[PDB]
Amino acid sequence: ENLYFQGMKKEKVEQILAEFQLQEEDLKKVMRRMQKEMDRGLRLETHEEASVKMLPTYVRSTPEGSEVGDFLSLDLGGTNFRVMLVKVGEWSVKTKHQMYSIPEDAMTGTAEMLFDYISECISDFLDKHQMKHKKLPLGFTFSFPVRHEDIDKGILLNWTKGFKASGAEGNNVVGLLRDAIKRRGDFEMDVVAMVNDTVATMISCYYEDHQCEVGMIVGTGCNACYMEEMQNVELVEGDEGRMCVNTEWGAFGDSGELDEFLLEYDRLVDESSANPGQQLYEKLIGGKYMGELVRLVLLRLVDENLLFHGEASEQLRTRGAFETRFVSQVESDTGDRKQIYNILSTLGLRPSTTDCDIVRRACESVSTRAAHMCSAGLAGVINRMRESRSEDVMRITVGVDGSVYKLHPSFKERFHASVRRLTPSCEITFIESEEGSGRGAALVSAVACK
Ligand SMILES: Cc1ccc(NC(=O)[C@H](CC2CCCC2)n2ccc(C(F)(F)F)cc2=O)nc1
Ligand SMILES: OC[C@H]1O[C@H](O)[C@H](O)[C@@H](O)[C@@H]1O
Ligand code: NA
């Protein structure tokens, strides 16, 4: 209750939190470095060495012919596994849907276990809606880096976001799925398309706004896709029209590009992750890591005797116990500290009013940096598109999905303002996808099956 000492503690906390600050000049440097890696990823000469893969998706502008009817859309990679029945006409409407929690033994076991579980979920969905005998074209949203040979054929480059199933990396993902369906043998599907989640988001948003040519995810992980000129897509023969490119920007920094900005907290999260040294840019933004970064900031403040009387509870010293959703909930607190108190009390802590305020500042520090780093990536893509299109003023729509962008109380606002400062002569409209994956994957499958 000594207000002079409370102020001195908050001042020391501010000196430590200041490390998270990124000036406009730092963001421009990250943006330019991102653009240099994007150029590298698209070229035949430097693609293999590029950290940002810029993977061709085989999704094109003006696809021509499209089929109508019932489509099954799958989604693996986000939160849980989703199966959706989509009706495509003229339009595209989600008619039926089911989500399945993936057992930990299937995300880190064998690819056979994972794909067997996926096939079991498909069998369950078809029974709940009496359609197992019906052979529908299937579209698969698969949220991982894939080197495509075509819309329905592509190899998994590597798992990300903690996935580790053996026997998948280097294999045709559509083949892994088709093989698992065949081993079960209680239904038949024509797997016609595979798309990244950024791609499915862009397409579902494009359906509502034809100026949408960028898709971005800020959920468990962070990535973006955009419509590139075919002349710039050196990995695909042809120079007419546009093709969607999956940047896989989460791997920016994997070649040392973010070294000067990485803090001790980033090094610890990276070292304890399933993929050390990989997805470094994603680890600064994604919901799989955000809460954990705050947890490590709190432990440093506990160690400096600036928080919780210099004592950390068993829960606070537990990996993953400071959930990303707590970061959003802390920053939603009205000022009375009730929401912050609840989270901290549940974590086995006995927080003071000052402890609550410090935890809020730690959350703001990590989430603001996530918003700012993300903004440099999106600004790099948009600025590159304006330049490639020889546009004086580019008016574009960005379709977005993911829990961090959608649910965090201020990330969106901080992110938009920073993107806008970095994108002179661009008019950017941001739209949130409404059941993004399913509709997007079905529209792609409708074209793919002729
Ligand atoms: C194998 C293959 C190859 C190309 C494609 N391309 C499409 O489906 C494009 C993608 C869009 C074009 C620019 C942004 C993304 N698309 C998607 C939906 C709609 C609509 F909403 F009208 F139904 C119109 C449309 O043209 N799909 C499959
Ligand atoms: O789910 C968001 C993103 O997560 C990881 O970055 C994946 O590598 C990427 O494919 C996906 O788009
Ligand atoms: Na090309």
Residue 29, exposed/middle/buried by CB under 10 A (0-12, 13-18, 19+)?
middle
Taking the C-alpha atoms of residue 278 and residue 158, their distance in angstroms, rounded to an integer, is 10
Taking the C-alpha atoms of residue 408 and residue 420, their distance in angstroms, rounded to an integer, is 19
Q: Domains along the chain?
A: 1-56+208-434 (3.40.367.20), 57-207+435-447 (3.30.420.40)
- Residues comprising the binding site for ATP? 75-80, 220, 287-288, 324-328, 403-407
CA-nearest residue, atom 2 of ligand 2: 221
Resolution value, angstrom units: 1.8
Cα(139) to ligand 2 centroid in Å equals 18
Ligand nearest to C-alpha 229:
3
CA-nearest residue, atom 23 of ligand 1: 207
Which residues carry out catalysis?
Answer: 161, 197
Laid out side by side, the sheet with 136-142 consists of 92-100, 81-88, 69-76, 136-142, 189-195
Looking at residue 279, the DSSP 8-state letter turns out to be S
Give the technique used to solve this structure.
Answer: X-ray
Taking the C-alpha atoms of residue 317 and residue 277, their distance in angstroms, rounded to an integer, is 23
Q: Give the number of the atom of ligand 1 that is nearest the alpha carbon of residue 92.
A: 23
Q: Are the C-beta atoms of 351 and 308 separated by less than 8 Å?
A: yes
Distance set, CA 160 to CA 49, 167, 280 (Å) = 19, 15, 11
| C-beta 219 within 6 A of ligand 2 | yes
| C-beta 215 within 6 A of ligand 2 | no
What residue type is 218 in one-letter code?
A: V
Cα(179) to ligand 2 centroid in Å equals 24
Cα(228) to ligand 3 centroid in Å equals 10
| C-beta 403 within 6 A of ligand 2 | no
Residues with CB under 6 A from ligand 1: 58-61, 63, 151, 202-203, 206-207, 213, 227, 443-444, 447-448
- Nearest CA to 399 out of 445, 443, 364 is that of 443
As a whole number of Å, the end-to-end CA separation of the chain is 72
Ligand nearest to C-alpha 207:
1
Burial 402-429 (b: 16+ CB within 10 A, else e): bbbbebbeebbebbbebbeebbeebebe
Q: Are the C-beta atoms of 439 and 86 separated by less than 8 Å?
A: yes
CA-nearest residue, atom 5 of ligand 2: 221
Q: Give the number of the atom of ligand 2 that is nearest the alpha carbon of residue 197.
A: 12
Most distant pair of Cα atoms in the chain: their distance: 74
- Nearest CA to 153 out of 174, 170, 179, 169 is that of 174
Q: Two tokens at 399?
A: 């379709």
- Nearest CA to 288 out of 402, 410, 430, 414 is that of 402
Looking at residue 99, the DSSP 8-state letter turns out to be E
Cα(314) to ligand 2 centroid in Å equals 32
Q: Are the C-beta atoms of 57 and 246 separated by less than 8 Å?
A: yes
Cα(388) to ligand 3 centroid in Å equals 14
Residue 224, sorted as left (phi over 0), alpha (psi -120 to 50) or beta, turns out to be: beta
- Nearest CA to 246 out of 219, 230, 228 is that of 228
Ligand nearest to C-alpha 283:
2
Residue 209, sorted as left (phi over 0), alpha (psi -120 to 50) or beta, turns out to be: beta
